[PDB]
Design an enzyme around this catalytic site. Structure first.
Site, PDB file in Angstrom:
ATOM      1  N   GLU A   1     -38.642 -52.991 104.399  1.00  0.00           N
ATOM      2  CA  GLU A   1     -38.677 -52.045 105.494  1.00  0.00           C
ATOM      3  C   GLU A   1     -40.085 -51.792 106.045  1.00  0.00           C
ATOM      4  O   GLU A   1     -40.296 -51.798 107.256  1.00  0.00           O
ATOM      5  CB  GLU A   1     -38.051 -50.697 105.093  1.00  0.00           C
ATOM      6  CG  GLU A   1     -36.541 -50.682 104.879  1.00  0.00           C
ATOM      7  CD  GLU A   1     -35.726 -51.027 106.110  1.00  0.00           C
ATOM      8  OE1 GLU A   1     -36.216 -50.879 107.257  1.00  0.00           O
ATOM      9  OE2 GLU A   1     -34.562 -51.445 105.927  1.00  0.00           O
TER      10      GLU A   1
ATOM     11  N   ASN B   1     -37.413 -48.182 118.549  1.00  0.00           N
ATOM     12  CA  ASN B   1     -36.239 -48.969 118.905  1.00  0.00           C
ATOM     13  C   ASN B   1     -35.985 -48.692 120.379  1.00  0.00           C
ATOM     14  O   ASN B   1     -35.348 -47.696 120.739  1.00  0.00           O
ATOM     15  CB  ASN B   1     -35.048 -48.524 118.066  1.00  0.00           C
ATOM     16  CG  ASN B   1     -35.339 -48.575 116.573  1.00  0.00           C
ATOM     17  OD1 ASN B   1     -35.487 -49.658 115.995  1.00  0.00           O
ATOM     18  ND2 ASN B   1     -35.438 -47.409 115.945  1.00  0.00           N
TER      19      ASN B   1
ATOM     20  N   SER C   1     -34.859 -44.404 119.579  1.00  0.00           N
ATOM     21  CA  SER C   1     -35.110 -43.752 118.299  1.00  0.00           C
ATOM     22  C   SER C   1     -36.269 -44.482 117.621  1.00  0.00           C
ATOM     23  O   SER C   1     -36.630 -45.595 118.019  1.00  0.00           O
ATOM     24  CB  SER C   1     -33.869 -43.759 117.402  1.00  0.00           C
ATOM     25  OG  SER C   1     -33.589 -45.070 116.959  1.00  0.00           O
TER      26      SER C   1
ATOM     27  N   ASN D   1     -34.642 -43.281 110.160  1.00  0.00           N
ATOM     28  CA  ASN D   1     -34.403 -43.084 111.586  1.00  0.00           C
ATOM     29  C   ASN D   1     -34.289 -41.636 112.088  1.00  0.00           C
ATOM     30  O   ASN D   1     -33.634 -40.790 111.469  1.00  0.00           O
ATOM     31  CB  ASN D   1     -33.173 -43.880 111.983  1.00  0.00           C
ATOM     32  CG  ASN D   1     -33.009 -43.989 113.462  1.00  0.00           C
ATOM     33  OD1 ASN D   1     -32.278 -43.218 114.069  1.00  0.00           O
ATOM     34  ND2 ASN D   1     -33.671 -44.963 114.055  1.00  0.00           N
TER      35      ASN D   1
ATOM     36  N   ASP E   1     -38.126 -45.379 113.661  1.00  0.00           N
ATOM     37  CA  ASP E   1     -38.001 -45.487 112.207  1.00  0.00           C
ATOM     38  C   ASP E   1     -39.362 -45.065 111.638  1.00  0.00           C
ATOM     39  O   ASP E   1     -40.395 -45.601 112.039  1.00  0.00           O
ATOM     40  CB  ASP E   1     -37.696 -46.929 111.802  1.00  0.00           C
ATOM     41  CG  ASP E   1     -36.346 -47.415 112.318  1.00  0.00           C
ATOM     42  OD1 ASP E   1     -35.376 -46.624 112.330  1.00  0.00           O
ATOM     43  OD2 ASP E   1     -36.268 -48.591 112.724  1.00  0.00           O
TER      44      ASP E   1
ATOM     45  N   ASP F   1     -32.328 -47.929 121.791  1.00  0.00           N
ATOM     46  CA  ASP F   1     -31.649 -46.644 121.708  1.00  0.00           C
ATOM     47  C   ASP F   1     -32.544 -45.414 121.705  1.00  0.00           C
ATOM     48  O   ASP F   1     -32.073 -44.304 121.475  1.00  0.00           O
ATOM     49  CB  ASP F   1     -30.636 -46.606 120.555  1.00  0.00           C
ATOM     50  CG  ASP F   1     -31.277 -46.569 119.192  1.00  0.00           C
ATOM     51  OD1 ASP F   1     -32.504 -46.667 119.068  1.00  0.00           O
ATOM     52  OD2 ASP F   1     -30.524 -46.422 118.225  1.00  0.00           O
TER      53      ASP F   1
END
Length: 130
Positions: free
Chosen positions: A35, A46, A51, A60, A53, A49
């Site tokens: 990750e 992202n 959002s 998220n 991380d 959408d």
């Protein structure tokens, strides 16, 4: 902060991650490795959408933490996403525990299924004394 492998393994164990909701320490290690590369300041927007991380576990903002700019988001961890960018991962670990307490478990992170699930993950904790 970019953790060294064994340093992280020992930290995660002390924070009670080994076997949490049936997830072994080596799996949490495999998750953090893919990750963020064990980097607590890693962030990923992202665009698809709107959002982001955050952190070592790339949690998220749509469901887990609040950053104010993510549309229709909830904050299940009741944390500012900022808390997931500290060198001290206590907050990130507490929120990761919340994530897996949902029926999906570790499947919440698609990276887990792709790179960790059904693999020999021993290497992530080999020699760390955990």
């Amino acid at each position: 902060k970019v953790f060294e492998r064994c340093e992280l393994a020992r930290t995660l164990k002390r924070l009670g991650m080994d076997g949490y909701r049936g997830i072994s320490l080596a799996n949490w290690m495999c998750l953090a490795k893919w990750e963020s590369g064990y980097n607590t300041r890693a962030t990923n927007y992202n665009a698809g959408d709107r959002s982001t991380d955050y952190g070592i576990f790339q949690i998220n903002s749509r469901y887990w933490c609040n950053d104010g700019k993510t549309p229709g988001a909830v904050n299940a961890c009741h944390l500012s996403c900022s808390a997931l960018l500290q060198d001290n991962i206590a907050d990130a670990v507490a929120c990761a525990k919340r994530v897996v307490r949902d029926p999906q478990g570790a499947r919440a992170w698609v990276a887990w299924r792709n790179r960790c699930q059904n693999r020999d993950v021993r290497q992530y904790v080999q020699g760390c004394g955990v």
